[PDB]
Design an enzyme around this catalytic site. Structure first.
Site, PDB file in Angstrom:
ATOM      1  N   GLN A  97       0.810  -1.213   0.000  1.00 56.25           N
ATOM      2  CA  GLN A  97       0.000   0.000   0.000  1.00 56.25           C
ATOM      3  C   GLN A  97       0.847   1.269   0.000  1.00 56.25           C
ATOM      4  O   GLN A  97       0.304   2.364  -0.182  1.00 56.25           O
ATOM      5  CB  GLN A  97      -1.033  -0.094   1.136  1.00 56.25           C
ATOM      6  CG  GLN A  97      -0.573  -0.203   2.591  1.00 56.25           C
ATOM      7  CD  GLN A  97      -0.479   1.095   3.352  1.00 56.25           C
ATOM      8  OE1 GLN A  97      -1.463   1.824   3.505  1.00 56.25           O
ATOM      9  NE2 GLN A  97       0.665   1.314   3.966  1.00 56.25           N
ATOM     10  N   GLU A 157      -2.781  -4.275   4.232  1.00 51.56           N
ATOM     11  CA  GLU A 157      -3.889  -3.442   4.665  1.00 51.56           C
ATOM     12  C   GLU A 157      -5.061  -3.625   3.715  1.00 51.56           C
ATOM     13  O   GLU A 157      -4.869  -3.615   2.491  1.00 51.56           O
ATOM     14  CB  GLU A 157      -3.512  -1.954   4.722  1.00 51.56           C
ATOM     15  CG  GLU A 157      -2.617  -1.562   5.875  1.00 51.56           C
ATOM     16  CD  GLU A 157      -1.157  -1.729   5.545  1.00 51.56           C
ATOM     17  OE1 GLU A 157      -0.834  -2.664   4.787  1.00 51.56           O
ATOM     18  OE2 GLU A 157      -0.342  -0.911   6.021  1.00 51.56           O
ATOM     19  N   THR A 208       4.831  -1.830   5.085  1.00 55.53           N
ATOM     20  CA  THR A 208       4.476  -3.227   4.840  1.00 55.53           C
ATOM     21  C   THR A 208       5.350  -3.888   3.781  1.00 55.53           C
ATOM     22  O   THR A 208       5.618  -5.094   3.844  1.00 55.53           O
ATOM     23  CB  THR A 208       3.017  -3.337   4.409  1.00 55.53           C
ATOM     24  OG1 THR A 208       2.811  -2.561   3.223  1.00 55.53           O
ATOM     25  CG2 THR A 208       2.118  -2.816   5.493  1.00 55.53           C
ATOM     26  N   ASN A 249      10.950  11.883  -3.634  1.00 50.04           N
ATOM     27  CA  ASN A 249       9.832  12.817  -3.610  1.00 50.04           C
ATOM     28  C   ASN A 249      10.287  14.268  -3.547  1.00 50.04           C
ATOM     29  O   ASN A 249       9.640  15.135  -4.139  1.00 50.04           O
ATOM     30  CB  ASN A 249       8.915  12.505  -2.428  1.00 50.04           C
ATOM     31  CG  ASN A 249       9.568  12.800  -1.098  1.00 50.04           C
ATOM     32  OD1 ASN A 249      10.753  12.535  -0.907  1.00 50.04           O
ATOM     33  ND2 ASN A 249       8.804  13.371  -0.177  1.00 50.04           N
ATOM     34  N   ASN A 304       2.849  10.410  -9.114  1.00 50.23           N
ATOM     35  CA  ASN A 304       2.558   9.113  -9.700  1.00 50.23           C
ATOM     36  C   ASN A 304       2.400   9.206 -11.204  1.00 50.23           C
ATOM     37  O   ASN A 304       2.838   8.301 -11.920  1.00 50.23           O
ATOM     38  CB  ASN A 304       1.296   8.534  -9.067  1.00 50.23           C
ATOM     39  CG  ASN A 304       1.394   8.434  -7.563  1.00 50.23           C
ATOM     40  OD1 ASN A 304       2.388   8.843  -6.963  1.00 50.23           O
ATOM     41  ND2 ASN A 304       0.355   7.897  -6.942  1.00 50.23           N
ATOM     42  N   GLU A 314      19.266  -6.291 -23.156  1.00 52.11           N
ATOM     43  CA  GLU A 314      20.301  -5.319 -23.481  1.00 52.11           C
ATOM     44  C   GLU A 314      20.581  -4.400 -22.302  1.00 52.11           C
ATOM     45  O   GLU A 314      21.733  -4.025 -22.058  1.00 52.11           O
ATOM     46  CB  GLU A 314      19.889  -4.515 -24.714  1.00 52.11           C
ATOM     47  CG  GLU A 314      19.939  -5.295 -26.029  1.00 52.11           C
ATOM     48  CD  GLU A 314      18.877  -6.378 -26.154  1.00 52.11           C
ATOM     49  OE1 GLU A 314      18.137  -6.633 -25.179  1.00 52.11           O
ATOM     50  OE2 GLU A 314      18.790  -6.984 -27.243  1.00 52.11           O
TER      51      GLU A 314
HETATM   52  N1  LIG Z   1       5.120   4.327  -2.339  1.00 48.70           N
HETATM   53  C1  LIG Z   1       4.614   5.418  -1.807  1.00 48.70           C
HETATM   54  N2  LIG Z   1       5.310   6.062  -0.830  1.00 48.70           N
HETATM   55  C2  LIG Z   1       4.803   7.165  -0.300  1.00 48.70           C
HETATM   56  C3  LIG Z   1       3.585   7.683  -0.677  1.00 48.70           C
HETATM   57  N3  LIG Z   1       3.418   8.836   0.084  1.00 48.70           N
HETATM   58  C4  LIG Z   1       4.495   8.940   0.906  1.00 48.70           C
HETATM   59  N4  LIG Z   1       5.346   7.903   0.665  1.00 48.70           N
HETATM   60  C5  LIG Z   1       6.640   7.540   1.231  1.00 48.70           C
HETATM   61  O1  LIG Z   1       6.669   6.128   1.135  1.00 48.70           O
HETATM   62  C6  LIG Z   1       6.818   5.514   2.392  1.00 48.70           C
HETATM   63  C7  LIG Z   1       5.731   4.461   2.558  1.00 48.70           C
HETATM   64  O2  LIG Z   1       6.292   3.268   3.056  1.00 48.70           O
HETATM   65  P1  LIG Z   1       5.495   2.412   4.165  1.00 48.70           P
HETATM   66  O3  LIG Z   1       5.048   3.323   5.281  1.00 48.70           O
HETATM   67  O4  LIG Z   1       6.402   1.343   4.692  1.00 48.70           O
HETATM   68  O5  LIG Z   1       4.237   1.716   3.437  1.00 48.70           O
HETATM   69  P2  LIG Z   1       3.643   0.274   3.860  1.00 48.70           P
HETATM   70  O6  LIG Z   1       4.639  -0.772   4.351  1.00 48.70           O
HETATM   71  O7  LIG Z   1       2.884  -0.262   2.674  1.00 48.70           O
HETATM   72  O8  LIG Z   1       2.617   0.644   5.043  1.00 48.70           O
HETATM   73  P3  LIG Z   1       1.744   1.991   5.005  1.00 48.70           P
HETATM   74  O9  LIG Z   1       2.538   3.144   5.535  1.00 48.70           O
HETATM   75  O10 LIG Z   1       0.573   1.831   5.945  1.00 48.70           O
HETATM   76  O11 LIG Z   1       1.380   2.319   3.570  1.00 48.70           O
HETATM   77  C8  LIG Z   1       6.647   6.603   3.434  1.00 48.70           C
HETATM   78  O12 LIG Z   1       7.689   6.590   4.380  1.00 48.70           O
HETATM   79  C9  LIG Z   1       6.735   7.903   2.684  1.00 48.70           C
HETATM   80  O13 LIG Z   1       8.016   8.447   2.859  1.00 48.70           O
HETATM   81  C10 LIG Z   1       2.874   7.021  -1.691  1.00 48.70           C
HETATM   82  O14 LIG Z   1       1.782   7.367  -2.133  1.00 48.70           O
HETATM   83  N5  LIG Z   1       3.404   5.894  -2.233  1.00 48.70           N
END
Ligand SMILES: Nc1nc2c(ncn2[C@@H]2O[C@H](COP(=O)(O)OP(=O)(O)OP(=O)(O)O)[C@@H](O)[C@H]2O)c(=O)[nH]1
Ligand SMILES: Nc1nc2c(ncn2[C@@H]2O[C@H](COP(=O)(O)OP(=O)(O)OP(=O)(O)O)[C@@H](O)[C@H]2O)c(=O)[nH]1
Ligand SMILES: Nc1nc2c(ncn2[C@@H]2O[C@H](COP(=O)(O)OP(=O)(O)OP(=O)(O)O)[C@@H](O)[C@H]2O)c(=O)[nH]1
Lengths: 427, 150, 438, 427
Positions: C11, C71, C145, C206, C228, C254
């Protein structure tokens, strides 16, 4: 009768063969659908040299196309003349090469070599008497190099008696695209020079020089590039297929043009290139065709032999001309610049005079020359290869493929031998 | 305007045909020929005839706009041209004078230029596949004909 | 034929996956129904679409993608969204508990009972699949996650099917900005556990996206929708060659041959040159010389690495749209002649060119422009080790004070792996310095 | 058959090249498009002295334009007779010169001289055999002088067997506009006298005077000025292309007119000028023709000859004359004023008689003679140079480009030598 089977490999081949064949079709008058239109007796009568006979005024190309990625086959078939080829004359594998020459040379080939050999012997026994084979590819082209090396290695012992024309293209001195190009070049040359007899050299940067000199059209297409080089090979092949009191056989050329077992590399050249307004601002005379053909700018093969000297030259003129203009022109150049020739041989020129020109213009020609020009080319490749081998960068893939450094060592030894011999014979 | 020319040696064509623009000034009755510039043309484009007045007949006459109309040809220092059509203020002013305008005409295109690029045409036809719609839409739908054979 | 498998874990990354499939539907005219308008081309699955969508006889382009998360929130939301019929039902794999940023929690306590299902799904894709060139995994190092679970699954796929490619994109830790102080830990764990199993890794940040957004997009209030969309456009660029026809084409084979010189080191950087607005593209001009100078402009890179700090090894350029190679190679020659850029002696040639004639695409309601020439830059250089130095000189302090290691031992792990990871890093930096040594 | 190759340089010398070529074309009766209009079999016979032939009745001139400013060549190209020149024959640089001398002598010429030499050798090979070359330029012109110095230097050695006609224009005694102008001229004249055989000396102030003498129309155009100079140049060339009891070669004139290796400065002379009443109010008789020939006002080169003394005189006559009347004219003029000739050589007169009338009148003449005349000209320019070199104003650009004062010193030594030499031959 005597004939030829064409071989096309590598992605470069996958377009060059198309262009070359469509130009020949335009010449002998075959519509894209394939139904002959009678307008020229000679084109009607000397066609078995390449075309075999199908039913109903239709003809098959005795060419074999090879690749691994079916997308290129898709493009060729979708092209303006893809229909004129056969499905059987197409064969492909089910993997990618990624121009790892070792991958292609011990893994990717072993499973299609048998089939391609079956098809090629099929076509050979379909014919009656061959002059030999010509194969079009790139020495820097990984798929082309890997396939062609093994192919020629096999056809050498299977038919030890024919003419082995190799028509391959050269990497760019200024930028090579692929970083492993030195490695590919070594792995190509080390066996190509011992399997082949005649090798052509063609350079894209020289083509761009041609564009900035005579084309003067700013943005060209590689299609036009293929147009020019296809015209060159067409010209070298015309002599066999047309009447006229001249000598034709590629053997009758090679015996003149080949002094030594190690002398194989040649320098093509084309004849009048019209500029933007030169069409109706020029005058078509034997003297000026001669002057243009022997001009530094017109050169397209490797790099200026102004540094070097000249060993042999073969010129094929085409149209209604006379023996006297060619004879006097050659004596004129001989006496004019009598120093940049080599004293070993006297009268290094070999003339051929074909009666019938290309369709539309009156008098034309083409050139080929054995002279010291490839030296700086393989000198550059030597320095690149030493700089790369010094730290085995990128070499782990080949280690995994089952390659050992001794191979690279003997390849560089061989190329050093060629460097030394070419320098030595005249210096 | 436009004009034709014949190629003696080249591989492709009998002839080439070129478009040009004509500007007639109202100040000193100078006129200027300008070719539009197209890439890969393989001709020196730019300015073809600089600022000056022009000679109709031998004596020294001058192409007074009182004689020019649509659909007219004229020879000018050798090369002869033909007028196709004009633009807004031009015909407005010229009819304000009252020159009877002639019906217009098509401006041709260079076959060399078109064959340089491509045939502008259409594509798209694959093989024939629509079974799902029939199957689902017409579940167990049948017809019942009573026929007689003699 | 030529087709890949899309993996979207976390997520963290599912929203960007959503965005990228939304962008993919436009250019092929995939309607949120999943079926085409009148013009028939459906058949034996033989035309451009088949590289991304497995349209069966249903008339429904179903993607060869899988989303996996622990999640249920975002996945339930998206199945309540628009493209829910587009997506196949249980290739949206959901769990209930998250890793709470804990790498070990995401790697051991939960990882046992979902790998089975995802194995089943990946094999039931692969069987009907025929090309299987490789995988596009999308994850995150600081994965709340994604991180540990992704490391474990890529471990198992590396050990089971070792004869194809693996590609990784990742959001990078922000060098001076944090979202969870777990980040150095989870980052180092993922990195060292993956180093001997990761083919190619590409990095995005970012903050750099944001700086670009208010430098040339010139909108001071951006969104993840913007982030995105940009990254999705990047991946569309990198796969256009496989997708469509062209003068000359290149492939992941390649890439994995040319870009990486050695074992281990496989961490290049991405760039997109014509990142500009509609009005700018309208009453300005676009061409190869300026876009080429832009691709080496140092401030448009999505990693805060100073170029003159480092030196270059590899440069793969994908030119998409209308070009001829003449001015292209002329411009790259002029760049070679430029003095400030410093090539190592290891690469007297480093320019992997790929020309695809098909111009790129705008999106309705988007913020991009009607580009003709685009160039995408994939370059590997030494200037990135600064990021690793920044990470380690903080990892050491947090190790010394050993906070939250109580959490880690409580969830059932030790300090030995943490010990060994730091000299794994130290080996990486020493190798960077050795290769920099001429 | 013997031909001449023509060079055009300097933004004025280009003016003159256009006007001269179009004058010859109109005389020989050629459209702007190159298609001949058959009127004169003799002119068609002798076209080959200047004009090659391009297939389809197109007589490509054997001229070459060289300069550095694109817009100038755009103008001459878009002139009503610019299309007759060749896209091949347009070599040029992508820069300005600044109306400097050393810039165009070292900085930029070095990278254009190669191309111009290649094209000129191409055309030289194309043609059969040469009497020599003729150059149109400006001694005061920046780019023209900067080129021509090096050009004549380059051609002298490998072609030491031909005749190098030089054609230029002196800046006005009262004003030169350009101020570095005498610097440039004093640079050039050294190499010019070193490499010269024949030189035409012209200034436009006398030409304005002539306009106010006989055309009375207040305001001409520099185009009309170049009309007149084109006629004056055509004068010598009339001989070869027409039959008649005269000798035609530039050598035939030049050995006669050149007593010592150090005599190369020659003053034009033209045929009856026309006023709006004169077209039917003139009395066209050889008496008044020759009277006008030696009319002080008829002289148009620099200034009054009656200060000095004549050394040699030559008259080319154009039309259906007889030789006894001109001969007795020469007799009578010697009788009347023998004073201002010299005892060194009597019978200072030569008469050549070409017999084809010009386009517009029946009989005419061109006078070319050398006298003790240029003393005041170069003396004036010498006080100019002394004044400017008194503190070396403006020298800094020339020094930055790389020059030194010593070269100026030996150059001025050369001009003082010319002063003394001419003064003595008079004395
Ligand atoms: N990939 C992604 N990263 C984001 C986004 N918004 C902020 N981030 C950064 O990406 C990281 C997300 O990693 P995690 O917190 O480990 O995500 P996760 O393990 O799927 O668990 P959740 O936080 O609940 O989503 C954050 O620390 C932010 O720095 C987004 O929309 N997508
Ligand atoms: N047809 C074609 N070939 C080109 C062109 N430009 C360069 N080439 C070269 O032609 C070579 C031969 O292609 P192939 O032999 O079919 O390719 P390969 O064996 O897979 O090896 P690679 O060189 O890595 O592509 C390539 O290596 C290119 O370097 C072009 O514009 N058209
Ligand atoms: N084309 C043209 N040239 C003229 C005209 N009037 C005078 N000139 C002369 O042209 C001379 C310079 O011409 P060039 O021989 O081409 O000199 P350059 O090397 O190009 O450099 P400049 O002398 O600075 O012009 C000036 O000094 C003028 O005396 C004119 O009306 N048209």
């Amino acid at each position: 009768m005597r004939e030829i089977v064409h071989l096309q490999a590598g992605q470069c081949g996958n377009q060059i063969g198309a262009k070359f064949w469509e130009v020949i079709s335009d010449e002998h008058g075959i519509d894209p659908t394939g139904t002959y239109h009678g307008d020229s007796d000679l084109q009607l009568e000397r066609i078995n040299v390449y075309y075999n006979e199908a039913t109903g005024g239709k003809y098959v190309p005795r060419a074999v196309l090879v690749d691994l990625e079916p997308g290129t086959m898709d493009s060729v078939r979708s092209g303006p003349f893809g229909q004129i080829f056969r499905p059987d004359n197409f064969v492909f594998g089910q993997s990618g090469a990624g121009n790892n020459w070792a991958k292609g040379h011990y893994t990717e080939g072993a499973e299609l070599v048998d089939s391609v050999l079956d098809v090629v012997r099929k076509e050979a026994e379909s014919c009656d008497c061959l002059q030999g084979f010509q194969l079009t590819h790139s020495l820097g082209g990984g798929t082309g190099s890997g396939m062609g090396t093994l192919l020629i290695s096999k056809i050498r012992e299977e038919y030890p008696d024919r003419i082995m024309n190799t028509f391959s293209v050269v990497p760019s001195p200024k930028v090579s695209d692929t970083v492993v190009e030195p490695y590919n070049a070594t792995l190509s040359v080390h066996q190509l020079v011992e399997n082949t007899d005649e090798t052509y050299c063609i350079d894209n940067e020289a083509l761009y020089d041609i564009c900035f000199r005579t084309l003067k059209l700013t943005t060209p297409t590689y299609g036009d590039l293929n147009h020019l080089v296809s015209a060159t090979m067409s010209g070298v092949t015309t002599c066999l297929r047309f009447p006229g009191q001249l000598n034709a056989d590629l053997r009758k050329l090679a015996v003149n043009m080949v002094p030594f077992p190690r002398l194989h590399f040649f320098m093509p050249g084309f004849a009048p290139l019209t500029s933007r307004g030169s069409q109706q601002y020029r005058a078509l005379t034997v003297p000026e065709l001669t002057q243009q053909m022997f001009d530094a700018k017109n050169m397209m093969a490797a790099c200026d032999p102004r540094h070097g000297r000249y060993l042999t030259v073969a010129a094929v003129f085409r149209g209604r001309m006379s023996m006297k203009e060619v004879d006097e022109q050659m004596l004129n150049v001989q006496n004019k610049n009598s120093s940049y020739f080599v004293e070993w041989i006297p009268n290094n020129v070999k003339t051929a005079v074909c009666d019938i020109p290309p369709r539309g213009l009156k008098m034309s020609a083409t050139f080929i020359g054995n002279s010291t020009a490839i030296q700086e080319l393989f000198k550059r490749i030597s320095e690149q290869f030493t700089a790369m081998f010094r730290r085995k960068a990128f070499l782990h893939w080949y280690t995994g493929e089952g390659m050992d450094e001794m191979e690279f060592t003997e390849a560089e030894s061989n190329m050093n031998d060629l460097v030394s011999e070419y320098q030595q014979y005249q210096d | 305007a436009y004009f034709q020319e014949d190629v003696p040696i080249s591989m492709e064509e009998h002839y080439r045909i070129r478009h040009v623009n004509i500007y007639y000034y109202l100040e000193d009755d100078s006129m200027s020929v300008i070719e539009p510039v197209v890439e890969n043309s393989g001709i020196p484009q730019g300015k073809l005839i600089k600022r000056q007045r022009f000679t109709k007949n031998d004596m020294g006459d001058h192409y007074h706009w009182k004689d020019l109309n649509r659909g007219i040809n004229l020879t000018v220092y050798g090369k002869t041209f033909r007028i196709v059509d004009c633009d807004r203020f031009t015909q407005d002013f010229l009819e304000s004078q009252g020159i009877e305008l002639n019906p217009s005409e098509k401006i041709p295109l260079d076959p060399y230029t078109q064959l340089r690029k491509e045939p502008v045409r259409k594509y798209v036809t694959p093989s024939d596949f629509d079974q799902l719609k029939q199957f689902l839409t017409f579940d167990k739908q049948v017809l019942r004909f009573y026929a007689i054979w003699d | 034929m030529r087709e890949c498998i899309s993996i979207h874990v976390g997520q963290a990354g599912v929203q960007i996956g959503n965005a990228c499939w939304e962008l993919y539907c436009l250019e092929h005219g995939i309607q949120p129904d999943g079926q085409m308008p009148s013009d028939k081309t459906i058949g034996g699955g033989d035309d451009s679409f088949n590289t991304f969508f497995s349209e069966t006889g249903a008339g429904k382009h179903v993607p060869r993608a899988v989303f996996v998360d622990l999640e249920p929130t975002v996945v339930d939301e998206v199945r309540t969204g628009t493209y829910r019929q587009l997506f196949h039902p249980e290739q949206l794999i959901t769990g209930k508990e998250d890793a709470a940023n804990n790498y070990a929690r995401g790697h051991y306590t939960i990882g046992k009972e979902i790998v089975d299902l995802v194995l089943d799904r990946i094999r039931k894709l692969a069987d009907l699949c025929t090309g299987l060139q490789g995988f596009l995994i999308f994850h995150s190092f600081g994965g709340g996650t994604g991180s540990g679970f992704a490391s474990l699954l890529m471990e198992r796929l590396s050990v089971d099917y070792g004869k194809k490619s693996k590609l990784e994109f990742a959001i990078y830790p922000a060098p001076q900005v944090s979202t969870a102080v777990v980040e150095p830990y989870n980052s180092i764990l993922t990195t060292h556990t993956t180093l001997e199993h990761s083919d190619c890794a590409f990095m995005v940040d970012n903050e750099a996206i944001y700086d670009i957004c208010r430098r040339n997009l010139d909108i001071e209030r951006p969104t993840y929708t913007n982030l995105n969309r940009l990254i999705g456009q990047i991946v569309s660029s990198i796969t256009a060659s496989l997708r469509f026809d062209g003068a000359l084409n290149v492939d992941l084979t390649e890439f994995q041959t040319n870009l990486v010189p050695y074992p281990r080191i496989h961490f290049p950087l991405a760039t997109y040159a014509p990142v500009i607005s509609a009005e700018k593209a309208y009453h300005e001009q676009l061409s190869v010389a300026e876009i080429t100078n832009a691709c080496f402009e140092p401030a448009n890179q999505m990693v805060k690495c100073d170029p003159r700090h480092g030196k270059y090894m590899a440069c793969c350029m994908l030119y998409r749209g209308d070009v001829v190679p003449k001015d292209v190679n002329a411009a790259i020659a002029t760049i070679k002649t430029k003095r400030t850029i410093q090539f190592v002696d290891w690469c007297p040639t480093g320019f992997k060119v790929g020309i695809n004639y098909q111009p790129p695409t705008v999106v309705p309601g988007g913020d991009l422009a009607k580009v003709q020439r685009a160039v995408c830059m994939l370059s590997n250089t030494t200037a990135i080790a600064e990021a690793w130095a920044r990470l380690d000189h903080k990892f050491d302090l947090m190790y010394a004070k050993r906070a939250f290691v109580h959490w880690y031992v409580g969830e059932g792990m030790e300090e030995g792996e943490f010990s060994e990871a730091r000299e794994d890093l130290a080996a990486l930096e020493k190798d960077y310095e050795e290769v920099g040594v001429d």
